[PDB]
Every structure is written in structure tokens, then in C-alpha cells.
Amino acid sequence: NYGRGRELMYQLEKKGKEIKRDLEKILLSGQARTDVLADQYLTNSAADPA
Amino acid sequence: NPTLFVSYDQNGKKLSFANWISVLSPQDTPFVSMTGKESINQTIFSWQT
Q1: How far separated are the first and last CA of chain B, in Å rounded?
Q2: Cα torsion for B39, B44, B45, B48, to the nearest 10°?
Q3: How close A3 comes to chain B (CA, Å)?
Q4: How far apart are CA B36 and CA A39, in angstroms?
Q5: Cβ-proximal residues to B9 (8 Å cutoff; 6+ apart), any chain
Q6: Which of A48, B28, B36, B48 could form a disulfide with A3 if both were Cys (CB 3.0 to 4.6 A apart)?
Q7: Phi-psi region of A30 (alpha: psi -120 to 50; beta: other; left: phi over 0)
Q8: Dist CA A7 CA B26 (whole Å)
Q9: Considering only CA atoms, which of B27, B42, B47, B4 is closest in space to residue A5?
Q10: What is the least distance, in Å, from the CA of B22 to any CA of chain A?
């Protein structure tokens, strides 16, 4: 290509910018954690089969 | 030969002329002179956004 450079690196850097924007938006919007741990955040508590 | 010192004693004067021209109205355009021009040889140019 002439300005596109190529099809891989250009697309990758564009997607990097896009994910950066999405990350900033998701961080600044406001949302509480929802991971299912049920008070086992600390006390590593291996996955507890079943 | 200083003889009269009125009008013709010192001939070959500069006629009260100076080597600088005064354009009474401002007609300069610093905008283009600031924005530098770039050369292009070919005619298949292309730019990216």
C-alpha cells in the first residue's frame, strides 16, 4: 500500500487505540466488581471443586 | 574650488535620495511566509488519516 503501510500493523495499532478508548470509557463510566468469589477475595481459597 | 557655497559649489549631489522604499500602506502577509511550503516531484501523492 501507499499510506496504509500494510494490512496487519495498521489494523493492530488501530485496534490498540480502539481498545485504549474503550478501556478509558469503561473505567470512567462507573461499575462495581461482580466476580463470583463470595468473600473469598483474600485467603486464596483454591477453586473449591464442585 | 569653494566660490559660492549656495547652489552650484558642490555639483553631483544625491538629490536628497535614500536607498530604501517606503510602502505607506502595509501589504505584507506573514501567514504564508510562516507556513513553509514542501516540494513534490511526482504527481501520485497520497496521505493518510
Answers
A1: 80
A2: -160
A3: 5
A4: 64
A5: B2, B3
A6: B48
A7: left
A8: 53
A9: B47
A10: 49
Amino acid residing at A50: A
Grid cell listed for A37: 468469589
Chain A residue closest in CA terms to B44: A2
A34: DSSP letter: -
CA gyration radius for chain A? 20
Distance CA A13, CA A20 (A): 10
Q: Is the dihedral of CA B9, B10, B11, B13 positive or negative?
A: negative
| Residue at B46: amino acid letter | S
3-state secondary structure of A27: helix
